[PDB]
Symmetry: C2
Subunit: 598 residues, 2 copies
């Protein structure tokens, strides 16, 4: 019943439930000492589990080592006690009880004890032995394993410290009974970190243990005996990940969500905890790897499912999280978060990092996932052939991108076979303006005219193409000429989420293209690719009216200007194609910047 983990080739991380009877036997038999010190905090000093540990200690030391002492110190509670005062206070307590280099300091406590009393044990008598007894969940997973000790200067957190390996780490998970429910959700994010970088088989069990975990811990009294045998291996495989990484460039893989998370934690410092900034940072670095085309969109979501099923947040604007921060939230700008930071762990799939290393990402791609608006640079250098897979009404978007640029885009899921009517967009509304269509039975491809030689369809009616229209209006903007592009049969596009017809005639007028509202549709006139294509983003850029189709249609017209066009409400695409902007940067090589209003 003692799950041991080998760190640096030594199984010294003992993990088990209710092992306080075993801790006392093992440490006074192997670690020989005339002096044993148990340093705690005041919260654990009044607990039944710790009075169990000291009482058993003296009634085991009196038998096996009858010329030894047990000393006991109690640090005042708080994370603000991890300073130079308490390190100097407990170091003076050991210099007045006559402690020597043989002493064994049992640092009973969470992360504030396990980092400070390990640092005390590293500097006392040029270094003595320390045995961590972690009593919080975040201490058992990350803080105790590794031997990283530090205290907190006023000018900076975790700066003055030392590397000091513990002789033994006894993660007794029966100490989790007095832990708060918010100190329990906090430490679980350092378990989802180690299952999303190393062990996908652990990540799958962390989905079935979701509401069988959270309903037990957020109860009247947390009876964790109901989840006794299951919670001892949440901590066990989280240590097997960390111990093997600190044993073997690989050690930066445990810093996933600690690049965006340490920026968020440095501006929401006492209110939001560590795991409630790591979990928000893990869901913003999984998006940085999707924007760079390394992670699939499915993983951004399957990582999001596990954090939200644990209480942990996946946005800084989550309403269960905004109550905790409150008035400290308004200091989260991308001007200050990019100064708090750029190496970051880009995931490849759930349970594996890309090339097993941290990658150098720019300040521009980080300025995109941390925002909600987008600057679309012009379409200077697209690849001339591109096979895009949309998850038909999303396929028309890169097909229209090959109509305006005049390149080639093959959507290979659908042909002239499709039951969905939105897949007809190649053969009837892009072929009139001179695009080579080669619609087969499986693929669908356009090849537009070379940069501007579009001719305006006089009149099309869209009886299958109800939500396939706004992308037909942005390709009608480029074709100048007397032929007035007019579309009818757009009757259902009035009530869905915004009246799209008024949405087009308001925003196309910002582009400098003449348009007006036909009684059942739109009348795009069309203007030359560049001559009159300049919006007024300085005042207010193109609003997408909280619709996914407006945000993606006006990103296609934005690349024919010569200065970048701002499209407000970027994240409204999350219900049809949440990574449309990832395709423009990765699959199309169009540079995208983000923007916050000043």
């Amino acid at each position: 019943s003692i799950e041991k983990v080998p760190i640096l080739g030594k199984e010294t991380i003992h993990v088990g439930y209710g092992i306080a009877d075993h801790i006392v036997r093992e440490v006074i038999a192997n670690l020989a000492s005339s002096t044993y010190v148990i340093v705690t905090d005041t919260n654990m000093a009044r607990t039944p589990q710790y009075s169990k540990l000291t009482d058993d200690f003296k009634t085991n030391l009196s038998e096996k080592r009858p010329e030894s002492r047990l000393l006991t110190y109690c640090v005042s509670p708080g994370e603000n006690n991890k300073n130079r005062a308490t390190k100097a206070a407990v170091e003076d307590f050991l210099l007045q009880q006559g402690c020597t280099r043989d002493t064994v300091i049992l640092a009973v406590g969470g992360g504030v004890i396990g980092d400070m009393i390990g640092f005390v044990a590293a500097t006392f008598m040029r270094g003595v032995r320390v045995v961590q007894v972690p009593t919080t969940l975040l201490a058992m997973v990350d803080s105790s394993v590794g031997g990283k000790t530090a205290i907190d200067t006023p000018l900076g957190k975790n700066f003055i410290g030392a590397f000091h390996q513990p002789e033994y780490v006894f993660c007794d998970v029966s100490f989790l009974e007095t832990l708060p429910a918010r100190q329990f959700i906090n430490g679980m994010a350092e378990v989802v970190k180690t299952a999303a970088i190393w062990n996908e088989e652990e990540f799958t069990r962390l989905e079935n243990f979701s509401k069988k975990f959270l309903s037990v811990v957020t109860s009247k009294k947390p009876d964790l005996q109901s989840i006794k045998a299951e919670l001892v291996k949440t901590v066990l495989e989280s240590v097997r990940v960390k111990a093997g990484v600190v044993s073997s460039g690989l050690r930066n893989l445990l810093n996933f969500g600690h690049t965006i998370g340490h920026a968020i934690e440095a501006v929401l410092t006492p209110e939001a905890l560590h795991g409630e900034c790591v979990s928000i940072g893990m869901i913003k670095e999984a998006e940085l790897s999707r924007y760079l085309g390394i992670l699939p969109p499915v993983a951004v979501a399957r990582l999001s499912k596990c954090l939200v099923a644990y209480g942990l947040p996946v946005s800084i604007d989550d309403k269960e999280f905004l109550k905790k921060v409150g008035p400290k939230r308004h200091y989260v700008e991308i001007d200050i978060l990019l100064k708090k930071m750029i190496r970051c762990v880009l995931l490849e799939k759930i349970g594996k990092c890309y090339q097993l290393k941290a990658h150098q990402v720019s300040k521009q791609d980080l300025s995109f996932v941390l925002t909600d608006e987008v600057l679309v640079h012009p379409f200077t250098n697209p690849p001339k052939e591109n096979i895009i897979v949309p998850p038909a009404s999303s396929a028309t978007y890169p097909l229209a991108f090959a109509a305006m640029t005049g390149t080639s885009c093959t959507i290979p899921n659908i042909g002239s076979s499709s039951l969905q009517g939105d897949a007809k967009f190649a053969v009837d509304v892009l072929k009139p303006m001179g695009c080579k269509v080669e619609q087969t039975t499986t693929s669908t491809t356009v090849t537009g005219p070379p940069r501007g030689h579009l001719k305006p369809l006089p009149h099309v009616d869209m009886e299958p193409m109800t939500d396939a229209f706004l992308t037909a209006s942005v390709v009608a903007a480029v074709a100048k000429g007397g032929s007035s592009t007019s579309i009818t049969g757009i009757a259902n596009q009035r009530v869905k989420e915004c009246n799209r017809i008024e949405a087009m005639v308001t925003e196309l007028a910002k582009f400098g293209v003449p348009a007006n509202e036909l009684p059942d549709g739109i009348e795009i006139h069309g203007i030359d690719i560049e001559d009159l294509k300049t919006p007024e983003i300085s005042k207010r850029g193109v609003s997408s009216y909280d619709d996914h189709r407006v945000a993606m249609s006006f990103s296609l017209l934005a690349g024919l200007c010569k200065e970048p066009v701002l499209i407000l409400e970027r994240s409204t695409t999350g219900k049809t194609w949440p990574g449309w902007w990832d395709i423009l940067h990765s699959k199309f090589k169009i540079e995208l910047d983000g923007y916050e209003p000043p």
Copy 2:
């Protein structure tokens, strides 16, 4: 040109004179860092040697690494600045300028800077690189080489600290021009330590560099250019001892640091580190002589070198007693054995015995730190012993064989006074077998000595004292009288009154015939003279009374006390080493 010493396999201890040009080339080429921090002391920041170093540091960075910085801090002067305050102050200066985890800290200064700023470098960002620039002599020898860094808690000196090896130790001998003459003395003791435990060839050069060193450093201006070529190898071979020992035995560098740390903790700010180590080195060389491992010649040849450097060889030295002043009175052995037992016993000059520390008792340590001796009775001596005295001192272990019955063969007829065997021990009933060289007695079993009626010692005018204590235990009713003692009344102290005063403490009847002494005879039942009785047996500040009454003291039951133990330093300064080692007689010390 720039002498380098290998430590832990690699050559990082660069010793040389005036290498401030060489330091700033090597530390900015090999140690790559956007930030170089020179933490100096306020005394060194107003010196031409340090202003040479920083101004050459900036006019070297600007050329070789143009995107790098040089930051300069100034710690307040004093050994009281080695605390948690100044460590936290300079750790806040690094967290203000924006220093990284790769910053190279050039800890310019002595041992106070070299131990604190190295400990700063160990704790700052969990370890950054440190380059020691030692500017005092004791820093170049012990403090910098080794990686031991610490600070000083109020409850104890050098307790909170860490092991942190320096990436480079640039011992510049040209930094010794501004040193005080008292800090020369201080740090010179640590170089003697390393030549008395490891290198006898270095110890002989330290004898010839005696006042060719001391007259130059104690001058109106210390022009060390005159001895520039010899100061650079005083530190070099004293580092080769330290570097090889910390590589591979490390407790051998703690010679004189067991008795010396007891002396330093009672004479703390006045006596320095070397002026208690040198007194401790000369008291652990006597602990090894008392245990019969070191020869008496070495106790003296180690004393010659330290007293020729300004360093003291006793706590009651006159130049040292002015320094400590009123704190001297707290040196009693009750508090010195509390502050201490492992100690390095030397075997000869330049070699430790069995290359390890040995566990000495609290009784043998209570002998060298005192000036009085409590002689336990002669229960179990060896039955045969060959003792080599350095005639008038050969008669003491011969008389020990007369009052016990054993056989002492002094191996070296021609000697005038060495005829104590045949004329004053033989008739009392001793088997005497004087050869051409070996002069030997073999006494009769305990008590059976019969008193010689009239034996006169005209050429043995000193032996009267030794004859008298052996005559005290002899009975038979012949009233032993030894006349013809006329020289002694003027020789040192009047020895004839000194015998009749002190034998009367022993309960033997005696008196003074007009030109001599008249010893009567009592059996083994002879009044032990303790500390209670009139202080104790007073040696009256001459070597004969201290050694003759050590022979009578073993025929009692409860240990006698002899005052002024160290009065024997003119003839046989290790007579008490022979009783414990060569004779197995337990001896312990005593203070009033």
